[PDB]
Amino acid sequence: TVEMVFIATVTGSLSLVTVVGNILVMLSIKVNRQLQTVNNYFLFSLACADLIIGAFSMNLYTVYIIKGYWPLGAVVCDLWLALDYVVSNASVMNLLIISFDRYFCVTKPLTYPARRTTKMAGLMIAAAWVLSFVLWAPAILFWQFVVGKRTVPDNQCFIQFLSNPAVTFGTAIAAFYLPVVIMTVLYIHISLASRSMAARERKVTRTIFAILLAFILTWTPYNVMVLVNTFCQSCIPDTVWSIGYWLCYVNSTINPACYALCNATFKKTFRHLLLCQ
Amino acid sequence: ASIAQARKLVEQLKMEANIDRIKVSKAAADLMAYCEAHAKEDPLLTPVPASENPFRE
Amino acid sequence: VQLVESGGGLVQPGGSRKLSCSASGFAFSSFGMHWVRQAPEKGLEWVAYISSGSGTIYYADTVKGRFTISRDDPKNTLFLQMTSLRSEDTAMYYCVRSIYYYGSSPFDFWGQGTTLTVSSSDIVMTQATSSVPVTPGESVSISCRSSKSLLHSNGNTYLYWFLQRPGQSPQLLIYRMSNLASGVPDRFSGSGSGTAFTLTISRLEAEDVGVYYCMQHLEYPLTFGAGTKLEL
Amino acid sequence: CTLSAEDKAAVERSKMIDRNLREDGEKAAREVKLLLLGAGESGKSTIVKQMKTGIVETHFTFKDLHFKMFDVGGQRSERKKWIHCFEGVTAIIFCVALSDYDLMNRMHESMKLFDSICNNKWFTDTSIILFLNKKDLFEEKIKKSPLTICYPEYAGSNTYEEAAAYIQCQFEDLNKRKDTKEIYTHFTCATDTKNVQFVFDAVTDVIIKNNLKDCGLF
Amino acid sequence: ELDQLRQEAEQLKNQIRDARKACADATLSQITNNIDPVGRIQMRTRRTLRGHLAKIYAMHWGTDSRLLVSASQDGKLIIWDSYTTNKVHAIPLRSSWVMTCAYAPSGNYVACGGLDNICSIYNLKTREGNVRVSRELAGHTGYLSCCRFLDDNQIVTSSGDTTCALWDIETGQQTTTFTGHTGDVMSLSLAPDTRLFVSGACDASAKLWDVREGMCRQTFTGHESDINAICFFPNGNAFATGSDDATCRLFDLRADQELMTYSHDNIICGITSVSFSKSGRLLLAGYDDFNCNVWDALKADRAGVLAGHDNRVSCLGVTDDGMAVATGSWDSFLKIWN
Ligand SMILES: Cc1c(Cl)c(OCC(=O)N2CCN(C)CC2)nc2sc(C(=O)NC3CC3)c(N)c12
Ligand SMILES: C[N+](C)(C)CC#CCOC1=NOCC1
């Protein structure tokens, strides 16, 4: 059990480093007035969502793993699953609105940044979060209530509504694959618009490929292995979905670090904070 | 033009030449003398007490 | 920097009328305007407050809710709508402009104003004497005492001294105790400590005779003292 | 609280002042500031007249874009002493008279000026929209006399296309760094109305650069 | 003609430097021996005034030790309060490229000098309250580098061309043209008695002048590059100048020679602004490197650093009463240290 608790401490250290990174990036946003631009409100919202997911997912998933089954109560477990899943959807829709921001910035830079002002960013972040909540949280909490019985087992507490994938697949596709499709489309167009010097194109295209492929590699596997189970259960054993969970959480971990490293001023402010101590 | 400019240069040069001058030791003593008299009145030199320090709160 | 008001007149009790003042020759937007009304045989009392950008609005306790005051910067006019007219409402209203910053002189210019007539928890400003007899060329001192200490933590007192002439609108005299206003001769001076305050006039000219006024600015009822006449 | 009523009115005034400052900064950031420069006896007045003391600021809007144009060439002082004040300009409109090649010589003086300006530490990332003037007169003068007089290292002949390409590449190669900035060149003459169009296009390209830098998508 | 005059000028220069060497018997370092050092001095950021949005070039405390005037890269000259960090006035000037901040001793006028060789006098306490252009002083051929105030009636202006000036406020014409210099001019700080003021050369020449007569009295040399900022000792007998050579050099007006240099091997970046403190014991000097430094005027040993900015400290000033010091750098933020 010593090796397993060591792995648990490794996961905890990952949680600590990701929450530290998020808090550092948002403190950098706060202290630096230039970083408080309208284009960074979206990044601040993403950093907050990453704090939420990293702080309230790692420890509870480890204490799920410790016994294999869920040790805590059904209501608290369902609340935790609802909160984790809603913050995940909030993060992904925030990334989508960031992609829309990028598209409008590059395609039409003459009038759009003046037209957006600052109310538009707040309206976007609030709308994204509330849309994620209304789309996903109440079905999560109320699937057991509607049927009136614990469709998932009490011991291995899980997400409830996957017991019937028919109601899950369409809305999950609308929540992820459509964001996948439109984010990839917008990034392809942002490269094509930046085509209108060649080293700049190569390196901006490399960065957009890096971000898009990180998003795909660290989000798609979970939402294809939750989709393929619409006809079988023994195909994917329980231990397999751990890698999918960790893969999504690695996506959440790498979003802020990559986004901060992609800008010089972010790491400059990080060095300033380190010097200040 | 240039000749007159250089002539006024040399006129100014003898202007700063003819001045009466004090010894550098006396000058240093006078610079220190102003410091000692106003040493207590200097707020940055010694930590001013909190109550009469108006910038702290 | 003239301030002229329009409206008012004989109104049946309980009626509604619009009281508007026109501003010209000075930057209206930065300034925070005021309304103070005077009965024909009574001293003044504060009525309403407006701020730059209309962010902050305050009223007197008696006139709360019933009145509505809103400034129109592009129109360069401040207008006050008048409701629930009573015998305590009939008066002449004074248009007051004030700017608030460090070293500012709030309440420095007062408009002529207009008269409105109808059918017929506050700190107190007290004045020891009224209609005091005085001789020209002498020194006269008038006391205005506040129930609440006006010194505050900033160390600056907040009593404003105003001078009224027969048939003339009041002007600012002491924008803060021991601080003299522009356009005012050096004869006037002020001094006081704690709550006990006084205004000292070194010499008296024939023009500078009439009712004097004192107020407070720590809090917002903006109370005035009962005026003191000066008798030759 | 423990603030006076007039102190609260003053903090309200400070908030109003901050709001006005925010509005002014928002409407000023969207404006594009183009630093105009050039060599001695350059056609700066001519290029200003084509569009639409010390500094003569120019106000004009093109395609819903208010431009700032600053004919700083009429200063007659030490550049490296106040050129730090011009950090952050969207672009540096450079002016080089082509025809003054036979005319210490004007072309090499302007080349030294360009080397300094483009390699100044304040303009590490500000793109330069280079302009070359009087193409027709330069062509006539090249047909009259060869360009080799100004350039001892010239290898081509006396033809318009090759001469223009040679001088363009010589000016472009002057940059010590070429990844952070870019040099946009337009051969312009007196009867060239498309100058405002080229300025607009170069400003669009550079502002796409700036926005992509700011967004961190890089 | 020319040869004779140049050679006699060289002979005069040799004579004056030899006579200065005759006067210099013992240096200030030897004079101030066995004296208690001030020790390490640390001053925290009491206030960070964040009104501005661009580079800050100049800043000047007031006589009341209460109000701050801060120029900026944009057309703003927002006047600050110190205790309650309000914005008393916001001045929308026209020549956005400004590098001067002059605050009248009476607190009634504030002056700014743009890069367009124009010094603009702004009224503060006026009927119909808002800042208005009092006068537009013109007549220079170069950019205004620094401006001061004798009183509400006269203003001394350093200019890019090698000439200072004592202006008239009522009539725009200047009463005395101070063209007895060479190079460029950067800094000028008046004496406490408003009688003598110096000039900040671009060729290491701190020239003391006379406001009434109209010619130099004592020419100073000693740096190998341009001198940026000058500030008088509180007595008005000496001053220390900060050049681009990363050297603070303290002069005097009764020996016309150096007293001591302030140069550290670590610092290679030059001085942008220098300003003494009360009693003149400290020597506060801004630096091109993202840091400000505290010295001692009698001993070259360095006091505590004054850092915290993200860009070079372009201006520095100490309150007249000496309570505290504010720092203004090219980051919009201005820090006041006590
Ligand atoms: C959410 C969940 C469900 Cl819904 C589940 O049951 C799946 C199932 O039987 N299907 C497929 C066949 N259909 C007829 C009905 C639905 N099995 C596991 S296992 C595990 C985990 O996370 N295991 C971890 C600890 C290693 C889950 N989150 C999970
Ligand atoms: C299930 N968990 C919250 C652990 C991670 C996940 C997921 C997928 O959820 C969504 N994808 O796109 C939109 C919502």
Q: Does A30 touch chain E (CB under 8 A)?
A: no
Nearest-CA neighbor of A132 among A215, A226, A49, A26? A49
Q: How far is C25 from chain E (nearest CA, A)?
A: 7
Q: Provide the edge-to-edge strand list for the sheet that holds D183-188.
A: D57-61, D66-71, D32-36, D91-97, D127-133, D183-188
- Domain boundary among the residues C59, C90, C118 is at C118
Burial of D170 (0-12, 13-18, 19+ CB in 10 A): middle
CA angle E67, E68, E72 (to 5 degrees): 150
Break chain A into its structural domains and give their ranges: 2-276
Q: Tell me E185's DSSP state.
A: B
CA dist list (Å): A118 to A122, A123, D193, D210, E267: 7, 9, 38, 19, 42
Q: Which candidate from A102, A196, A197 shows the least CB-CB separation from D217?
A: A102
Which token pair is E64? 């009341």
Into how many domains does chain B fold?
A: 1
Cα R_g (chain A), whole angstroms? 20
Q: Are C201 and C188 in contact (CB under 8 A)?
A: yes
| Shared-domain flag, residues C164 and C193 | yes
Helix axes A198-225, A240-261, angle to 10 degrees: 160
* Cα gap A120→A105, rounded to integer Å: 14
Residues having CB within 6 Å of any atom of ligand 1: A 152, 158-159, 162-163, 229, 233, 238-239, 241-242
Is residue E47 within 8 A of residue E70, CB to CB? The reply is no
Task: Tell me which chains share at least 3 CB pairs under 8 Å with chain C.
Answer: D, E
Contact criterion met (CB below 8 Å) for C36 and C47: yes
Are residues C108 and C162 located together in one domain of the fold?
no
Same domain, C77 and C22: yes
End residue of a domain, out of C118, C142, C162: C118
User: Pick from C10, C47, C73: which is nearest to C221 by CA?
Assistant: C47
Using DSSP's 3-state secondary structure scheme, residue E95 falls into coil
Dihedral, C175, C180, C181, C184 alpha carbons, nearest 10: 140
Give the count of Cβ contacts less than 8 A between chain D and E: 78
Beta pairing class for C132-133 and C230-231: parallel
CB atoms within 10 A of CB D147: 20
Domain CATH number, residue C193:
2.60.40.10
Residues of chain C with C-beta less than 8 angstroms from the C-beta of D9: 32, 51, 56, 100
CB C77 within 8 A of CB C20: yes
Chain-centroid distance of CA E149 in Å reads 12
Distance separating alpha carbons of residues A56 and A252, to the nearest angstrom: 13
Among the four given CATH numbers 1.10.3720.10, 3.40.50.1000, 1.20.1070.10, 3.75.10.10, the one describing domain A2-276: 1.20.1070.10
Identify whether residues C164 and C108 lie together within a single domain.
no
- The CATH code of the domain at E1-337 is 2.130.10.10
Closest CA to D107 of D142, D75, D71, D77: D142
**Which residues have CB under 8 Å from A178's CB, separation 6+?**
none
Residue B11: CB partners within 8 Å, gap ≥ 6? none
CB E294 within 8 A of CB E303: yes
Check: CB of residue A78 under 8 Å from CB of residue A142.
no
Task: Kindly give, in sequence order, each residue whose CB lies less than 8 Å from that of residue D74, ignoring residues fewer than 6 positions away.
Answer: D44, D54, D56
Residue D77 is nearest to which of E74, E138, E184, comparing CB atoms? E184
Q: Which residue of E has its CA nearest to C26?
A: E128
Bridge-based pairing state of the strands D91-97 and D127-133: parallel
Q: What is the resolution of this structure in A?
A: 3.4
Q: Which ligand has the shortest distance to the CA of A95?
A: 2
Residue C110 Cα, gap to closest chain D Cα (Å): 19
Write out chain A residues lying below 8 Å of D218, CB-based.
203-204, 207, 262-263
**CA–CA separation, C27 and E259 (whole Å):** 54
In whole angstroms, what is the distance from residue E27 CA to residue B29 CA?
11
One domain, residues C108 and C209 = no
Residues closing a segment before a gap in chain C (C–N exceeding 2.5 Å): 120
Same domain, C45 and C151: no
Provide the H-helix boundaries in chain E.
2-23, 28-31
Chain D contact present for E311, CB below 8 A = no
What is the rounded distance in angstroms from the CA atom of residue A262 to the CA atom of residue D128? 25
Helix (H) or strand (E) holding E176: strand E174-178
- CA quadruple E209, E213, E217, E219: dihedral positive or negative? positive
Cα–Cα distance measured from residue E151 to residue C66, given in angstroms and rounded to the nearest whole number: 52
Structure method: cryo-EM
C151 with C182, same domain? yes
CATH class in words for D32-215: alpha beta
Flag if C55 and D16 touch (Cβ within 8 Å).
yes
Residue C60 near residue C40 (C-beta atoms within 8 A): no
DSSP for E187-217, written as a single string: ---B-TTSSEEEE-BSSS-EEEEETTT-SEE
How far is CA D148 from its chain centroid?
28
Interface mutation vs chain C, best among D3, D6, D19, most C CBs within 10 Å: D6
CA angle C43, C220, C154 (to 5 degrees): 115
The total of other beta-carbon atoms located within 10 Å of residue B3's CB is 10
Other CB atoms within a 10 A radius of the CB of residue D111 amount to 17
Spell out the residues 6+ positions from residue A205 whose beta carbon is closer than 8 angstroms to its own: A191, A194
What would you measure as the largest C-alpha separation in chain B, in angstroms? 65
In this complex, which of D4, D10, D12 lies closest to C158 when CB atoms are compared?
A: D4
Write phi, then psi, for A99 (nearest 5 degrees).
-60, -40
**Are C51 and C129 found together in one domain?**
no
Per-domain residue ranges of chain E: 1-337
Number of domains in chain C: 2
Report the C-alpha gap between A149 and A189 in whole angstroms.
48
